């Protein structure tokens, strides 16, 4: 909702409450999953060509008792945009690989989980410096590219570490050395085609015997396709990764091949059914694991839109992973899940 628009400054205050419940034989995901998100997007006109902006988004879980608080910052960044040249922003933001993979992250509840948060340059993460050029100086409609740098996020401070520390340090599964990446997308009418590449130094804390997938750098290569017209949405992405994909709590995959596909239709009366397939196939994993499925599921669901502010959905994760030693060791969910959600948003 735009709550302020005066003398060239605009402020949009937005959010949602998702009354949400999971049904699953897996009791670690089963039960109340209610949550809310809040955010703001602000923009200020500096000149006719130059605009400054900032965005912040926060998630607060609504499913805990009052003696605890489970909340986090999704994004927080400030930036400058110049008409027909580009933009730059810095902060917690999305990695440029997400420019392509976001195209299949459109499912009612699940999806978008061949990668995670704080996972090199694949999704949300800290310390992104992002440069973007839209429409190639305004001379090629629909063509966009981006180049991104990520600074090191290392070991926690004040915990007796003698190397690799940063002020905002964290556990090794969520660390990263310096990284660089890029994306190109082209959209003509309904069609879209895109590609992205990322390369991040891996830290010493990540390259210990306690984690599978030791390596100097984490690399990702992504291609994507999209069709979005005539009430039909189709998209697919394929990603090859090296020492970049987490294998639950075990560490990372030496190599992984990720694939996601989605098909959706929008009825006039407000119903939007969705069908999707995701898989992540790991190779040469180490410790005798050899080749294993990290993720494999079919997602069938539907959303009903009452209007732009109220909707309800059901999403059914038909989980094709089988319960074995590998998935047990990594703590990967192999059970089906049904989600039922009712969402108010502004």
């Amino acid at each position: 909702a735009e709550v302020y628009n005066k003398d060239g400054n605009k402020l949009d205050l937005y959010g949602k409450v998702d009354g949400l419940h999971y049904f699953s034989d897996n009791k670690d995901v089963d039960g109340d999953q209610t949550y809310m998100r809040l955010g703001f997007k602000g923009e200020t006109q500096v000149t006719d060509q130059l605009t400054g902006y900032g965005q912040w988004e926060y998630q607060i879980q609504g499913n805990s008792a009052e003696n605890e608080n489970n909340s986090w910052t999704r994004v927080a960044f400030a930036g400058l945009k110049f008409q027909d040249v580009g933009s730059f922003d810095y902060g917690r933001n999305y990695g440029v690989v997400y420019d392509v993979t976001s195209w299949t992250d459109v499912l009612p509840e699940f999806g978008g989980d061949t990668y995670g948060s704080d996972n090199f340059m694949q999704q949300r993460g800290n310390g992104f410096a992002t440069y973007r050029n839209t429409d190639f100086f305004g001379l090629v409609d629909g063509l966009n590219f981006a180049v991104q740098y990520q600074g090191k996020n290392g070991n926690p401070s004040g915990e007796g570490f003698t190397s690799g520390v940063t002020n905002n340090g964290r556990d090794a599964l969520r660390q990263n050395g310096d990284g660089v990446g890029g994306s190109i997308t082209y959209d003509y009418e309904g069609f879209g085609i895109g590609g992205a590449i990322s390369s991040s130094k891996r830290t010493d804390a990540q390259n210990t015997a306690a984690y599978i997938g030791n390596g100097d750098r984490a690399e990702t290569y992504t291609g994507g396709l999209k069709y979005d017209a005539n009430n039909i949405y189709l998209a697919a992405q394929y990603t090859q990764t090296y020492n970049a994909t987490r294998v639950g709590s075990l560490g990372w995959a030496n190599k992984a091949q990720n694939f996601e596909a989605v098909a959706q239709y929008q009825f006039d009366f407000g119903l939007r059914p969705s069908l999707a397939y995701l898989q992540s196939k790991g190779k040469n994993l180490g410790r005798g694991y050899d080749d294993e499925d990290i993720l494999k599921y079919v997602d069938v669901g539907a959303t009903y839109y009452f209007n732009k502010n109220m909707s309800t959905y059901v999403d059914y994760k038909i989980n094709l992973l089988d319960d074995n030693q590998f998935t047990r060791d990594a703590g990967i969910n192999t059970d089906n899940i049904v989600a039922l959600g009712l969402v108010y948003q502004f």
Binding site: A210, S249, L250, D329, A330
Partner: peptide, 23 residues
């Protein structure tokens, strides 16, 4: 989901033989 590491432990005990100093 090798190096020696020092650790410290502490507990109680009961003297059970005063002559032999058995605890």
């Amino acid at each position: 989901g090798g190096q020696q590491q020092k650790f410290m432990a502490l507990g109680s005990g009961v003297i059970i033989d005063a002559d032999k100093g058995y605890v």
